[PDB]
From TrEMBL, chain A:
One of its GO terms (cellular component) is plasma membrane light-harvesting complex. The keyword Membrane applies. This is Photosynthetic reaction centre H subunit N-terminal domain-containing protein. Keywords: Membrane, Transmembrane, Transmembrane helix. The modification N-formylmethionine is found at M1.
Automatic annotation (TrEMBL), chain E:
The keyword Metal-binding applies. This is Reaction center protein L chain. Fe(3+) binds at H190, H230. The keyword Iron applies.
TrEMBL record, chain F:
GO terms for cellular component: plasma membrane light-harvesting complex. The lineage of its organism: Bacteria, Pseudomonadati, Gemmatimonadota, Gemmatimonadia, Gemmatimonadales. It comes from Gemmatimonas phototrophica. This is Photosynthetic reaction center cytochrome c subunit. Binds 4 heme groups per subunit. Heme c 4 binds at H157, R165, V166, I167, M191, C202, C205, H206. Heme 1 binds at M68, C81, C84, H85. One of its GO terms (molecular function) is heme binding. Heme 3 binds at M191, C202, C205, H206. The chain holds residues 15 to 313 of 354 of the full protein.
Automatic annotation (TrEMBL), chain J:
It is found in: Cell membrane. The lineage of its organism: Bacteria, Pseudomonadati, Gemmatimonadota, Gemmatimonadia, Gemmatimonadales. GO terms for cellular component: organelle inner membrane; plasma membrane; plasma membrane light-harvesting complex. This is Antenna complex alpha/beta subunit domain-containing protein. GO terms for biological process: photosynthesis, light reaction. Residues 1-40 form the Antenna complex alpha/beta subunit domain. Bacteriochlorophyll a 2 binds at H28, W39. The chain holds residues 2 to 60 of 71 of the full protein.
Amino acid sequence: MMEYIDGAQIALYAFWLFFFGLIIYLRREDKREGYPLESPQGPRDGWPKGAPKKTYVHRDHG
Amino acid sequence: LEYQNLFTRVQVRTVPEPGIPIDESTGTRYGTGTFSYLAGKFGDAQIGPIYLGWAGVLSLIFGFIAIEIIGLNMWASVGWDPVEFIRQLPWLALEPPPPQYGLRVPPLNQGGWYLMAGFFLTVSIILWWIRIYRRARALQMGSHLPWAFASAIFLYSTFFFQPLLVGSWSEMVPFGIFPHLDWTSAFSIRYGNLYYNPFHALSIAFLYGSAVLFAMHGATILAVARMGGEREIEQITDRGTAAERSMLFWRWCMGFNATMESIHRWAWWFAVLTTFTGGIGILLTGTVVDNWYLWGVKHGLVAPYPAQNQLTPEQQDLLRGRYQGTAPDSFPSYVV
Amino acid sequence: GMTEEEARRFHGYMVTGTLGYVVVASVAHFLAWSWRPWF
Amino acid sequence: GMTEEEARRFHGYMVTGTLGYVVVASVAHFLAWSWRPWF
Amino acid sequence: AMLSFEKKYRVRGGTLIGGDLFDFWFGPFYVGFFGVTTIFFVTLGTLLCVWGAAMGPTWNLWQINIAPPDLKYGLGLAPLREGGLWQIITLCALGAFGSWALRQAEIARKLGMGMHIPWAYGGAILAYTTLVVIRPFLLGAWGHGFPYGIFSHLDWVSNVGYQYLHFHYNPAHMIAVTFFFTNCLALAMHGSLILSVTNPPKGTPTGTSEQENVFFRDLLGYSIGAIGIHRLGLFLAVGAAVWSAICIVISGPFWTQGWPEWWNWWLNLPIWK
Amino acid sequence: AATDTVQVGYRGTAMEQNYDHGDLKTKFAQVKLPQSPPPAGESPPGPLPWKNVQVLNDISIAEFNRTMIAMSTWVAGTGNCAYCHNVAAFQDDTLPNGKPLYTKIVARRMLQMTRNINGNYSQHVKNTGVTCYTCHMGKPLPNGLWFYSSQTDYLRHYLDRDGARVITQGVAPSNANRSSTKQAEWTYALMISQSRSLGVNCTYCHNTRQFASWREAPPARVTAYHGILMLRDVNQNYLAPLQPVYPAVRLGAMGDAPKAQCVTCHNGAYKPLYGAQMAKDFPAMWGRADWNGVPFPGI
Amino acid sequence: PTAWPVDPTTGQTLINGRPVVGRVFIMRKTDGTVKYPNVADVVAHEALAPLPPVVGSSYQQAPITNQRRMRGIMIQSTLWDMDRKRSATRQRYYPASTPANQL
Amino acid sequence: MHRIWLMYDPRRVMVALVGFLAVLALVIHFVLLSSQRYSWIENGTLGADQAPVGASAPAAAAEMSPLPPGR
Amino acid sequence: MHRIWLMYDPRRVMVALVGFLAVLALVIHFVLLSSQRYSWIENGTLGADQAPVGASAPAA
Amino acid sequence: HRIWLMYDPRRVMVALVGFLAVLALVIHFVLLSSQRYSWIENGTLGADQAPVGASAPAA
Ligand SMILES: CCCCCCCCCCCCCC(=O)OC[C@H](COP(=O)(O)OCC(O)COP(=O)(O)OC[C@@H](COC(=O)CCCCCCCCCCCCC)OC(=O)CCCCCCCCCCCCC)OC(=O)CCCCCCCCCCCCC
Ligand code: BCL
Ligand code: BCL
Ligand SMILES: CC[C@H]1c2cc3[nH]c4c(c3C)C(=O)[C@H](C(=O)OC)c4c3nc(cc4[nH]c(cc(n2)[C@@H]1C)c(C(C)=O)c4C)[C@@H](C)[C@@H]3CCC(=O)OC/C=C(\C)CCC[C@H](C)CCC[C@H](C)CCCC(C)C
Ligand SMILES: CC[C@H]1c2cc3[nH]c4c(c3C)C(=O)[C@H](C(=O)OC)c4c3nc(cc4[nH]c(cc(n2)[C@@H]1C)c(C(C)=O)c4C)[C@@H](C)[C@@H]3CCC(=O)OC/C=C(\C)CCC[C@H](C)CCC[C@H](C)CCCC(C)C
Ligand SMILES: *[C@H]1O[C@H](CO)[C@@H](O[C@@H]2O[C@@H](C)[C@H](O)[C@@H](O)[C@H]2O)[C@H](O)[C@@H]1O[C@H]1O[C@H](C(=O)O)[C@@H](O[C@H]2O[C@H](CO)[C@@H](O)[C@H](O)[C@H]2NC(C)=O)[C@H](OC(C)=O)[C@H]1OC(C)=O
Ligand SMILES: *[C@H]1O[C@H](CO)[C@@H](O[C@@H]2O[C@@H](C)[C@H](O)[C@@H](O)[C@H]2O)[C@H](O)[C@@H]1O[C@H]1O[C@H](C(=O)O)[C@@H](O[C@H]2O[C@H](CO)[C@@H](O)[C@H](O)[C@H]2NC(C)=O)[C@H](OC(C)=O)[C@H]1OC(C)=O
Ligand SMILES: COC(C)(C)C/C=C/C(C)=C/C=C/C(C=O)=C/C=C/C(C)=C/C=C/C=C(C)/C=C/C=C(\C)CC/C=C(C)/C=C/C=C(\C)C(=O)O
Ligand SMILES: COC(C)(C)C/C=C/C(C)=C/C=C/C(C=O)=C/C=C/C(C)=C/C=C/C=C(C)/C=C/C=C(\C)CC/C=C(C)/C=C/C=C(\C)C(=O)O
Ligand SMILES: COC(C)(C)C/C=C/C(C)=C/C=C/C(C)=C/C=C/C(C)=C/C=C\C=C(C)\C=C\C=C(C)\C=C\C=C(C)\C=C\CC(C)(C)OC
Ligand SMILES: CCCCCCCCCCCCO[C@@H]1O[C@H](CO)[C@@H](O[C@H]2O[C@H](CO)[C@@H](O)[C@H](O)[C@H]2O)[C@H](O)[C@H]1O
Ligand SMILES: [Fe+3]
């Protein structure tokens, strides 16, 4: 009985909340290299703060 | 004139061709490796042995029978004429059931073969998913590929569920090259212009973004391939100047960058979201919204244009038509 | 590279080939003109 | 490798060839004009 | 601010025009001469878009519509409120996109990179230039361009398609679509493969190019290899834009009938006429 | 490669018609040169001598004779009164052999049909109108003749069917519209036929962001809809019941009479004969008391 | 009400009783475009909703020679209006078929 | 100008020359075959006075128009 | 003249020539076959006076 | 004459020939597309018979 609110609109805002969540996650992943930034005012992290640098386990011998 | 890395002048060959490393049970590698000179000039040269297992073998049997039913119905529809089967091929169709059957089983010629081909094709696609999933596990890899493929299967399945939700198999996609494009156009006509479906618009943005990203990423890796940038796993585990320069190019160009790993996450999501937002847009169509342009008028998407015509009140009554009904099932004489 | 001796010899085959072609082409044009003039 | 002799000799061919072409084209325009003037 | 490794890369040189004059950064961004011309055209074009919104019927983002002129104006500039504004914005767009590609070339030269990125972007600029310059020029009026508005340009796409009754039957469009779809499939496979070797299940060692190569070869039957998949992705993505440019430039200037009746040549091949 | 374009909608919408300039000049010249000139108009007085005239009862003898000359050039060739008549005995509806002059029988019904078109369907043909030439072009057979074939032939929209709408006039789905996507495919087939019949594209009658919309569409869509109503009257009341008049060689495989469709008049042009106006010259065919203010002669 | 009053003294528009120096025009947005308020308002400018379908009460099957082999809905427009090969035309319908004891 | 044979490999100049002449020949033939006047495969046996000529000026009737009315 | 077969490989030029003649001959036959005048498979038995001729100049 | 020091004849000659070949081909097709100079179809018309474009209407 809500006239303006309809399921297609509800779905679309559900997607927007997921999508803006996804962009945040990807921008955290993008900062695992090269961060924190150098600046004349000291280190800078940008936003969001980056995920930490990964360490990779090599194949033990072969 | 500077070497563009688009073509390889000098290939090398190994007398042995590499095999599969591990987990040979419940299935085995067919064939053996051979080299293609043309494929070796586009990219890597070995045309390989191949893996099926139980799921792969069954997938091919189901999928062969599906394709065989489609082709034999196409060929029957030109009266078995093999010249017309080739000449008319892109116009030929195996066509869904008639609308008045709803979800009931239809007659064999009138869509009963269609539903049977659609069932075997669907099972074949699911078994092929199981194959890919099992093979990723057996190679000790992440499951990123089967979830990417699941997103495509999701869109495909909406061409079953949306006909189910509107209550008639007649709304399904005909198997045929031009016929399924006729369906695609008519679907947008029936539901009042799919451009105003916002999940269709999202799906397009991700389809275009996938082309943007693979153009950008493909060009980026070729621009640093002179420095080993194409050895991406090595650049991810042991960042070289090739990774540093590709990060700096995009940072200096557009103000932010990815990493050599995380660019592949951007790629993965843009591809996956194309078919996922697409599927949602189909499932909403005819179930929640029946005229997307009018939904766009309601929600403020539709740009105003000056009127091209104005109806008088009696024309508003005269120019309404009828909804389309059944075809006439007789050949009237007009003799009296 | 190319000597003048070959360069001069070769030019003689070019001229005779060219003249033969132009002679045939001009006969072909005059035949076409007789059949259906374009001015 | 160019020299002032090679340049000066080649200049003569380019000048004379250009002018000869412009002469043949001037006749072509004379013929075209006599057939169907554009002013 | 700079990446932790960036400073040693920030040398002078590699410009095409201007030399040292603009050879500096602003935050993350490289400026350069084509940076200055980029900002000029971006700013002028964007403010003229806002002016187009102001004199139109609404500020609603989806509904703003800066339309090209009537066809009667031909190749002239129309009155600014009658579509001449769309023409000025189009010149700014061409200037901004061209400046962007040349700035990319200056950046790539400064990093010792190949010119692949500027030329790949040239594919997109070609499609835009086809839509607003080449096809309208061949038709003899700028009014054949598409309008600048988030949904009104989709109305243009709809109507141009139905000018040919059934635009799916356009043969170059079928190729262009096939490239776009094949590109998206290839991008999902490339992303998945790199991620699945670099992020294996917990406690598994990091994968290798050999595992990637083996798995891919079970998918397509052949190994594409590392440089091959990036060549393919570039071929597919840029070919999609090039075939798009072809499919729209043949629609109108060269083919005027419905697209289904173009296929009459296939039905009349002499072996089966 | 030169293309002419006609704008038919608002400047940004790409509602436009495209014509291959060279190919259109050929079509237009091939209409203009055969287009038969009307004879001079004239009328002396006198009461009607006719023995067996049922339609042309409202017309002077000179205007009648003028009409018969026109009918012969438009249907049969300019002196070919033998096409319809036993030339010795014009009042006869039969040959000396006794067999019916089926051509004269048809032509009488075609006169009634033409008056019915020009008179009752002016909402379609306006002040251009039709004459025999509009369909016949100087030949006994018009173009676009169609017959019974299959139940789902879309040309039956011009005979016994009704209703082509498929779009919902609301946002949400409802019991009011249960059209199939197959029915949208059928309307799309029908509309391609209409577009080709006029040599126009969909934007001539629609803004394709809403095919359903009348306000966004050009006024030609209203005229088009009256053409559908006109064909149903023409086919049902005049052309189809000629079945027992024709020789069997003219009938379909079902033995049905030939029927008309949009292309029968339009022949691929936006107006028949590119808008040539002839009906005004022949009051015999008006079915109207005046044509664009010119009053009917009325003896 | 298409225009403001004009002063007879000087031929000059009066707005709210007071003169305007210049040639007064009524301001409008680009080409007089006006934003759509509502679905109801858009629908109020349209024809009425279509009448209900005419559906057949029962189905009579056609003679087999009137039944198309091809079930694709658009093929009459997309192929058959341009294709007129005789053998391809003959294949469009099922051939005649009669019980053997009726020959 | 026989020094032109010093500037290039003569084998390659013949390959380029043969290509240019062959392509230009086919261009002119298919142009003529597409024309009305020189459609020789259909109308080649017509006499020179019978062969088509492009009209100096088409006529018109004032109510007729080749193009629909525009906006 | 014959020294051209030093400048070019005979074995190779012959394949190029034979391929060119095959293509040329097939093109000319198919162009004729689709004409009206020379659709010889349908109308080849007509006499030369009876065979089609393209439309002439005479006009109003 | 020293311009030929700055540009290689092996390049210049092809560049000049390519320019002239394009320019000539452009002018011929522009004329052939005109009505007055569509000489394949109408070249046998006399100069008074050949088409002329529309004049000023004066009204
Ligand atoms: C349609 C479907 C597909 C659509 C697909 C769209 C995909 C878009 C993806 C890219 C968007 C992010 C771009 C980016 O990260 O730029 C770097 C910049 C700064 O962070 P940093 O790089 O890590 O650190 C550097 C900085 O800290 C210090 O640098 P410096 O001192 O040298 O320079 C000065 C500062 C000043 O800061 C700014 O100016 C930032 C202004 C950012 C405005 C644009 C935001 C757009 C968000 C779009 C997502 C969505 C927003 C709703 O830094 C800079 O100068 C950095 C300049 C960066 C210029 C980036 C311009 C990107 C414009 C993109 C427009 C996209 C329009 C679609 O980041 C930010 O400022 C924050 C961005 C956060 C990610 C967006 C997440 C939004 C989630 C929803 C809201 C969350 C609210 C809490
Ligand atoms: C007139 C036509 C309509 C229209 C009608 C539709 C319809 C209808 C649909 C789309 C859909 C899509 N449209 Mg749209 N579309 C139009 C205009 C456009 C324009 C444009 C520039 O105008 C663009 C760019 C697009 C773009 C898109 C895509 C973003 C989207 C499809 C995503 C995808 O990957 O599909 C391709 C991917 C798949 C189909 C997945 C298939 C995966 C399966 C598993 C593969 C099986 C293969 C099997 C194993 C073997 C088969 C063997 C054979 C049977 C023999 N449309 C207009 C408005 N469009 C779809 C969508 O999502 O809509 C919301 C959709 O259904
Ligand atoms: C290497 C020789 C010189 C030269 C030396 C001469 C001499 C000497 C004479 C002419 C003459 C003429 N020259 Mg020359 N001329 C040259 C190049 C050209 C070019 C050009 C495109 O480069 C052109 C258009 C001309 C044009 C002309 C005419 C104005 C005139 C009449 C002949 C003619 O039409 O020849 C067209 C040009 C050619 C076919 C090529 C040039 C060489 C040929 C052999 C012609 C000129 C020589 C002529 C037959 C000599 C006759 C005997 C003398 C009267 C004593 N010359 C070259 C560069 N020219 C005559 C003159 O002045 O008459 C009023 C004349 O006596
Ligand atoms: C993220 C969205 C994009 C996407 C993703 C995607 N698609 C994918 C994947 C991914 C990530 C896969 O991993 C999967 C794949 O395998 O890729 C190679 C697939 C796939 N995408 C496919 C197609 C496809 N993807 C499309 C689109 C897209 N895919 C999107 C753009 C489209 C479009 C645009 O329409 C198509 C047509 C397939 C090539 C493949 C899935 C193959 C599959 O399921 O096959 C099932 C088997 C059959 C149909 C039977 C074939 C039978 C043969 C005739 C052989 C018969 C042999 C013998 C006679 C029988 C056996 C006898 C026994 C005794 C042996
Ligand atoms: C050729 C293959 C595909 C491709 C590739 C590609 N695009 C690229 C690149 C590459 C390789 C870049 O390097 C470049 C880049 O830097 O990306 C980050 C870019 C890029 N692709 C972009 C977008 C984009 N690409 C698209 C398409 C594609 N890009 C192709 C499918 C699309 C589509 C289909 O819609 C869009 C929107 C940008 C993010 C970026 C180019 C950025 C640029 O040029 O920046 C300078 C200009 C501005 C920031 C703004 C200019 C504003 C104007 C002056 C005024 C507005 C006028 C405009 C015409 C109005 C339009 C309104 C619409 C609603 C119609
Ligand atoms: C043959 O029959 C079919 C089925 O009725 C007719 O098609 C009908 O009309 C179309 C609009 C529609 O597309 C289709 O779904 C269907 O509704 C078809 O046109 C032919 O019609 C003639 O025969 C009809 C018939 O069914 O017998 C007949 O219908 C009338 O008579 C029957 C039997 O007495 C009665 O049940 C019907 O109610 C009655 N219908 C009407 C509307 O009066 C048609 O007669 C008339 C007047 O319609 C026949 O039509 C003609 C012109 O002869
Ligand atoms: C064709 O036949 C019709 C009659 O079928 C003739 O119409 C005449 O004029 C009408 C105004 C009137 O309504 C009608 O009754 C009739 O008088 C028409 O003129 C043509 O006539 C020729 O063919 C006639 C025919 O039907 O065969 C033939 O008629 C005679 O022979 C038939 C057959 O044996 C017989 O049934 C008739 O009664 C007979 N009629 C007469 C008047 O003799 C005509 O022969 C004669 C002599 O009239 C034919 O006409 C002529 C001039 O020969
Ligand atoms: C209609 O509308 C449009 C189309 C628009 C209108 C416009 C058209 C336009 C612009 C046309 C332009 C035309 C043109 C312009 O220049 C045309 C120019 C044509 C030319 C240059 C033709 C030249 C031909 C030369 C030939 C064939 C030579 C052959 C030589 C042979 C065979 C000998 C080979 C060597 C031998 C045998 C032995 C060597 C021995 C050796 C080494 C030894 O013994 O050692
Ligand atoms: C119709 O509508 C639109 C189109 C719109 C209207 C507008 C049109 C416009 C804008 C037109 C512009 C025209 C133009 C502008 O510049 C035109 C310019 C034309 C020019 C420059 C022509 C020049 C030609 C030169 C030629 C042919 C040279 C020949 C030389 C020969 C033969 C000798 C070769 C030398 C050798 C071999 C060396 C031997 C020695 C050696 C090697 C040694 O000694 O080493
Ligand atoms: C002799 O062998 C021959 C020569 C015949 C072999 C050659 C065959 C040839 C030439 C085949 C050609 C095939 C072509 C050209 C096929 C074209 C296919 C295209 C383009 C298809 C496009 C789209 C189709 C779609 C989206 C179909 C979707 C269908 C679905 C999702 C159906 C699902 C059905 C289900 C799940 C049914 C379930 C069964 C019920 C409902 C009864 O119970 C659960
Ligand atoms: C006396 C005769 C002796 C034998 C002659 C043999 C003739 C063989 C065929 C000649 C024509 C082939 O066609 C001609 O091929 C040359 C080959 O470089 C092409 O030449 C061009 O394209 C090729 C690639 O295709 C490039 O490598 C080359 O740099 C460029 O000049 C011409 O664009 C084309 O027109
Ligand atoms: Fe990569």
